[PDB]
Amino acid sequence: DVGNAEVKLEEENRSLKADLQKLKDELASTKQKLEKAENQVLAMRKQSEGLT
Amino acid sequence: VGNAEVKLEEENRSLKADLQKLKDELASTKQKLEKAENQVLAMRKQSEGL
């Protein structure tokens, strides 16, 4: 039935959009954390070179 | 209205493809984060002795 297929797709689509928003938020945060960690590595390199 | 079902199928395909890509980018970024944090810890140790 067209009605059944449509309802199933609408349900999947609502569920996928919520999963997508979650993953988008998690990605943005993880990327920000990676940038921080990499800049930590660089700051420590300079501090370890300014000491040694 | 006539296009209702195919548009839903198209959206569905679009979302599923985006979902897989984001899961892939997330796992890759998480792995890089783990490596960088581990570099920080390794460098903390070498800095400790000196």
Numbering used by the authors:
A (entry chain A): 169 to 220
B (entry chain B): 170 to 219
Copied sentences from the primary study:
BAP29 and BAP31 are two homologous membrane proteins (∼50% sequence identity in humans) that reside in the endoplasmic reticulum (ER). They both consist of an N-terminal membrane-bound domain with three predicted transmembrane helices, and a C-terminal cytoplasmic region, which encompass ∼50% of the protein and is predicted to form a coiled coil, or more likely two coiled coils. The structures presented here now show for the first time that the vDED domain adopts a dimeric coiled coil fold with no structural similarity to DED domains.
The structure of the vDED domain of BAP31 was determined in two different crystal forms; P21 at pH 8.0 and twinned P3221 at pH 4.2. The vDED domain forms an uninterrupted parallel coiled coil dimer in both structures. Almost all residues could be modeled in the P21 form (172–233), but not in the P3221 form (169–220). Apart from that, the two structures are however quite similar and exhibit a RMSD Cα value of 1.12 Å for 94 aligned residues. It is surprising that part of the structure was disordered at pH 4.2, as the CD experiments show that the domain is considerably more stable at this pH than at neutral pH. We have no obvious explanation for this observation, but one possibility is that certain buffer molecules in the crystallization condition e.g. LiSO4 lead to partial unwinding of the coiled coil. This dramatic increase in stability is puzzling since there is no clear evidence for any substantial charge repulsion in the dimer interface at pH 7.0 (though Glu-174 may perhaps cause some level of repulsion), and since very low pH may in fact destabilize the 2–3 inter-helical salt bridges that are present in the domain through protonation of acidic residues. However, several cases have been reported of coiled coils being stabilized at highly acidic pH in spite of a loss of salt bridges. A possible explanation for this is that the loss of ionic interactions at acidic pH may be counteracted by favorable interactions between basic residues and anions present in the solvent, reminiscent of the counterion condensation observed in double stranded DNA.
